[PDB]
């Protein structure tokens, strides 16, 4: 019956047609003629992709349950989705720079540099997802889209069509996946997590080479090259690559499965923590914002923190969240895309080094006792830890993220039926719980409720988060 807000929990939520949201624009990307879409937000402005799929049924429902689950800088983000008589609609962030494949065939070769960045978010992501006990069984460049054409751009992995929960008490089986990348294991037909670590040892395998490890004339040939798992680093072609980056292709492409390395340890792997040491620069002012924006969050009510994270999660761009996606980075020490209570610790002990305080001003203990508050109160669906749309919703400036229009989207999607108010019965089904407590509709009640009538209309829901 707990009330423990989640992005996910926002994507079914509507009950208004996808065309009275969004307004289409032009096809976007590189594949079968109008399956994607770029659309407008009707009332905020913000662009975003459509898939349409004209209606196979039950599978779509298990990607969007799954999507739903993962909140990660490296993982695609789905904003809505939409089913009529005739079409179903996947409205997501968009990613303007195309598939990784597209860059690969476009040049020889990435340099060593250049793979390392690129790996190490995938691995950040599969990392992420591994924890979250979800394997994603399509690994390949098709499926990493570049968030835009600067030559900086984050990877997002994509298409979870054929991605699936994992237990260890059971094996999975399904022969499934892409004849260049698929796991000899998931061919045997009794397989782990580790499928998609060999996966993504391919992809580097390619980045470096520009070549597959394993090739033939067909999908039957490359399968059976697959299955015997032999590769090798031909020469000249691997001349110039570094041991480092061999080592962690062999740990990756590692046959047996039990001594293949984990998606953490390859993440934590000498070539992904050492290829640079570039710090991400992050101003004093911008942090101290920050933590003050964290820190004063404590002891807000369930329709104000569902609001804020709604805002938050499904209305902001990544332009307009650039400084906190940095500060993010900056304090994501094992840079796993989560923030732990240990990480939040050297955060607050790194704004006092920059700001020129003095740590044993404070006692011992004091920054553990202040990240304990911080935690129960950020800690938007109680995992503990604080996952990147917790961190930006909290840590924005909250001027700039309730913008009239943010408003307007946020009190019409918890206004299902748009009558005007917000009920109690509302708030509990954007939470997917089945009845808000009556104490908890109380405490909104008493700060937000102005004339009384044990709802919240617009006039009231905009004073609640302004005030
Ligand atoms: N959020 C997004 N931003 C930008 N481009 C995207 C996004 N999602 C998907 N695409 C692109 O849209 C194209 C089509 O993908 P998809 O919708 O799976 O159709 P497809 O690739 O033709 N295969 P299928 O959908 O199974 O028929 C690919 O180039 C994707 O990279
Ligand atoms: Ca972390
Ligand atoms: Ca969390
Ligand atoms: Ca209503
Ligand atoms: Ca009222």
Redesign the pocket.
């Known amino acids: 019956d707990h009330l423990h807000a989640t992005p996910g929990m926002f994507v079914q939520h509507s009950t208004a047609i996808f065309s009275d949201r969004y307004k289409g624009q032009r096809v ?5 003629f109008g ?2 879409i770029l659309c407008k937000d009707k009332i905020t402005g913000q662009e975003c ?1 459509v ?1 349409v799929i004209s209606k196979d049924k039950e599978s779509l429902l298990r990607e969007v349950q799954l999507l739903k689950q993962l909140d990660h800088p490296n993982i ?1 983000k789905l904003y809505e989705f939409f089913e009529d008589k005739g079409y179903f609609y996947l409205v ?5 720079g ?2 990784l494949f597209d860059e690969i065939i476009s040049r020889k070769r990435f340099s060593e540099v250049d793979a390392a960045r690129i790996i190490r978010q995938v691995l950040s992501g599969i990392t992420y997802m591994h924890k979250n006990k979800i394997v994603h069984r399509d690994l390949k460049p ?1 499926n990493l ?1 570049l968030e835009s054409k600067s030559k900086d751009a984050n990877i ?1 992995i ?2 979870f ?1 054929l991605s699936t929960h994992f237990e260890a008490s059971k094996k999975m089986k399904d022969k499934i996946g892409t004849a260049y990348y698929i796991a000899p294991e998931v061919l045997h037909g009794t397989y782990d997590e580790k499928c998609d670590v060999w996966s993504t040892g391919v992809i580097l395998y390619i980045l470096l080479s520009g070549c597959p490890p394993f090739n033939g004339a067909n999908e039957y040939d490359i399968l059976k090259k697959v299955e015997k798992g032999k590769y090798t680093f031909e020469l000249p072609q691997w001349k110039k690559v570094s041991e480092s980056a061999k080592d962690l292709i062999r740990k990756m492409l590692t046959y047996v499965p039990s001594m293949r390395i984990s998606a953490r340890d390859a993440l934590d792997h000498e070539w992904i923590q050492t290829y640079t040491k570039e710090q991400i620069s992050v101003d004093v002012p911008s942090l101290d914002n920050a933590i003050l924006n964290i820190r004063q969050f404590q002891g807000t009510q369930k329709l104000a923190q569902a609001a804020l994270l709604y805002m938050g999660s499904k209305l902001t761009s990544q332009d307009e969240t650039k400084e906190l996606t940095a500060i993010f980075h900056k304090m994501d020490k094992n840079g796993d895309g989560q923030l732990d209570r240990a990480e939040l610790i050297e955060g607050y002990k790194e704004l006092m080094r920059m700001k020129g305080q003095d740590a044993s001003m404070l006692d011992a203990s004091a920054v553990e006792h202040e990240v304990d508050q911080v935690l129960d109160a950020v800690d938007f669906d109680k995992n503990g830890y604080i996952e990147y749309s917790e961190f930006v919703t909290v840590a924005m400036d909250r001027k700039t993220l309730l913008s009239r229009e943010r408003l307007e989207r946020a009190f019409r999607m918890f206004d299902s039926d748009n009558s005007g108010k917000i009920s109690s019965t509302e708030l509990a089904t954007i939470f997917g719980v089945s009845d808000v407590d009556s104490e908890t509709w109380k405490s909104v009640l008493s700060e937000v409720d102005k004339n009384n009538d044990g709802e919240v209309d617009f006039d009231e829901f905009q004073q609640m988060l302004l005030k």
């Open positions: 976007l990307g590189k594949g079968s399956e994607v992709a898939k695609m997501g962030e968009v990613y303007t195309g598939e098709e889209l997002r994509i298409d069509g």
